[PDB]
Design a protein around this ligand. Structure first.
Ligand SMILES: COc1ccc(Cc2ccc(-c3csc(N)n3)cc2)cc1
Ligand SMILES: [Zn+2]
Length: 607
């Protein structure tokens, strides 16, 4: 049972294809058109079905060229409004009919952020982008908004001729709009089945730069070059991904760098991964995110979770692949480093949520929880810890990598559950069931808190970050002078960031220490947002007022909820800055991403 979807479940019927014809109106801030769903009954004598919707307007529902009777249920808050459609012919099992839904999006769609020209880079054209994960696709078009159904789709999107529309699909040509010479219609096709949460759309003054045989980089003219360099490793990473996971089945793999208010590091949208511009560190140092989004092409996009409760299979396995790709590119020692660093985040997640919080479990029950509200790093890192502990328990990377490739092939184009994964794990490792039984499953999968056992991490690259953080934390006033820029001479960007995480964990520090740190290290001048984000969190935690404007600028100048949400939270927990924080949010709420707004509001306990 998928408790996040009011629509008919897979056992009743399935959506095999979507055909989407729509036009983007930037004045009305609406998407208008038709959605043609080829639905296949899964039982004998199916007379009606129910689709997900949210803030949608339905003009009519057509089947076999005649208007049929439909019904929009009463809103269930974040789940939307169920939509029951009365079929004109009762369907045998496996039969199909196409349902043409004529709809229109609301300007407040939880899935779409509209950007005024002012809000973009060029300053001369508006901009639009979607974010359907986890259950916002229902806010774009009617559907069975659940990962338990996988459809193919085709699309024709009318957009003002001077803009460009890209989708999570293969480009299939562009021609002027015959009903209107002010508009172009861009075509798309996605011949691989996907869950509707991977449907994605973008419209704006986008250009492209090619950085690989199957890889263009899209963004506004102001960042296309910055971005094509930052992500030059894409092709290298895609090959390594193909070696570990098997053939990349989606054809093209393009990258889109969105405006600052995009809420996440990246979205593994097929054929077109979205990423936050905060990755543009100028040294390729945050490129693991690309490797993460690349890896989703196997774990998540190909083998998908059946319900959102088993989401850890998506990110858990993906992260596992991400760090192997980095391990291939820079060395096993660097793989462990990121692995140990993930454990440190997992601690921050459990310490913040609390050792008993339901959302520190690996498999969660999202009945009556807003998925947007449950999202965290737990599935990513605790999910990784389980796989990394199995790799060591079953004979090492090489062995476990073999199971991963077998896992991905076994369940490709399908949607599975945690139990499906457990059974196959036992099956692949039948000659090691003794070793498998050794694992406290009920604790790993359904118990809160840190994992029962901590894997073994290589410390080689982490030692320097521990060494420097111990000096700073144990130093008295007569040690502050010896600190000096040379202390970092041999620290890489990733090491520089882990040192700040090492220190950030023992906050607050003496205000004198924080100042001496800015004085010797000049951390203010760094633009890598990961480093700068942790720096300003340390300052604000250590009650340095001077950081209050810096933290506010960063919390508002970009929208990545990884950075924005903590910064705002820390700022609201600092008495000197609480008022500004709550004032600034109010001032910005209307122009923030709909999901980011709601969540920052909940964090500040406002409205
Ligand atoms: C756009 O990003 C997304 C937003 C919503 C979701 C849904 C979803 C499901 C499970 C979890 C989970 C598993 S264990 C734990 N503690 N939480 C979290 C979120 C996924 C991605
Ligand atoms: Zn992910």
């Amino acid at each position: 049972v998928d408790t996040c979807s009011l629509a008919s479940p897979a056992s009743v019927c399935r959506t095999k294809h979507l055909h989407l014809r729509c036009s983007v109106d930037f004045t009305r801030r609406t998407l208008t058109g038709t959605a043609a769903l080829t639905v296949q009954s899964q039982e004998d004598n199916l007379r009606s079905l129910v689709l997900d919707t949210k803030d949608l307007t339905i003009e009519k529902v057509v089947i076999n060229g005649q208007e049929v009777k439909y019904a929009l249920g009463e809103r269930q808050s974040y789940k939307g409004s169920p939509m029951e459609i009365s079929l004109p012919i009762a369907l045998s099992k496996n039969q199909e009919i196409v349902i043409e839904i004529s709809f229109e999006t609301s300007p407040k769609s939880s899935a779409l952020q509209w950007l005024t020209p002012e809000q973009t880079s060029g300053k001369e054209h508006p901009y639009l982008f979607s974010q359907c994960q986890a259950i916002h696709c229902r806010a774009i078009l009617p559907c069975q908004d659940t990962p338990s159904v996988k459809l193919t789709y085709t699309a024709e999107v009318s957009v003002p001729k001077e803009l460009v529309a890209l989708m999570s699909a293969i480009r299939d040509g562009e021609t002027p709009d015959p009903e209107d010479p002010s508009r172009k219609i861009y075509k798309f096709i996605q011949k691989v089945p996907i869950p509707c949460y991977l449907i994605a759309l973008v419209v704006g003054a986008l250009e492209s730069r090619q950085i690989g045989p199957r890889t263009l980089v899209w963004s506004e003219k102001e960042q296309v070059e910055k971005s094509a360099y930052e992500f030059s490793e894409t092709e290298s990473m895609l090959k390594i991904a193909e070696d570990l996971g098997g053939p990349y089945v989606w054809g093209q793999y393009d990258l889109l760098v969105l405006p600052p208010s995009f809420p996440y590091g990246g979205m593994e949208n097929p054929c077109l991964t979205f990423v936050t511009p905060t990755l543009l560190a100028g040294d390729k140092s945050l490129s693991n995110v690309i490797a993460h989004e690349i890896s989703h092409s196997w774990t998540g996009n190909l083998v998908t979770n059946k319900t959102w409760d088993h989401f850890w299979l998506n990110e858990g396995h993906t992260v596992y692949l991400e760090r192997h790709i980095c391990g291939r590119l820079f060395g096993e020692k660097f793989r462990h480093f990121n692995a140990l660093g993930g454990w440190g985040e997992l601690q921050n997640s459990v310490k913040t949520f609390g050792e008993t919080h339901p959302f520190t479990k690996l498999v969660v029950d999202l009945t009556d929880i807003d998925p947007d509200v449950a999202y965290s790093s737990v599935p990513y890192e605790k999910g990784f810890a389980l796989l990394f502990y199995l790799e060591q328990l079953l004979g090492g990377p090489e062995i476990f990598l073999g199971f991963l490739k077998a896992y991905v092939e076994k369940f490709s184009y399908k949607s599975i559950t945690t139990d499906d994964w457990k059974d196959f794990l036992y099956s692949y490792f039948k000659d090691k069931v003794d070793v498998l039984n050794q694992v406290d499953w009920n604790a790993w999968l359904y118990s809160p808190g840190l994992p029962p056992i901590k894997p073994n991490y290589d410390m080689t690259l982490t030692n320097a970050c521990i060494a420097l953080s111990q000096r700073w934390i144990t130093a008295k006033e007569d040690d502050l002078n010896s600190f000096n820029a040379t202390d970092l001479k041999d620290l890489s960007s990733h090491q520089l960031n882990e040192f700040l995480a090492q220190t950030l964990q023992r906050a607050p520090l003496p205000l004198g220490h924080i100042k001496r740190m800015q004085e010797v290290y000049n951390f203010n001048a760094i633009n890598n947002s990961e480093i700068r984000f942790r720096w300003l969190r340390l300052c604000i935690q250590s009650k340095w007022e001077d950081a209050i404007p810096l933290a506010l600028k960063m919390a508002t100048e970009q929208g990545r909820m990884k950075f924005t949400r903590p910064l705002f939270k820390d700022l609201a927990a600092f008495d000197k800055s609480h008022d500004q924080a709550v004032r600034t949010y109010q001032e910005h709420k209307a122009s923030m991403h709909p999901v980011t707004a709601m969540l920052v509001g909940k964090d500040l306990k406002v409205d």
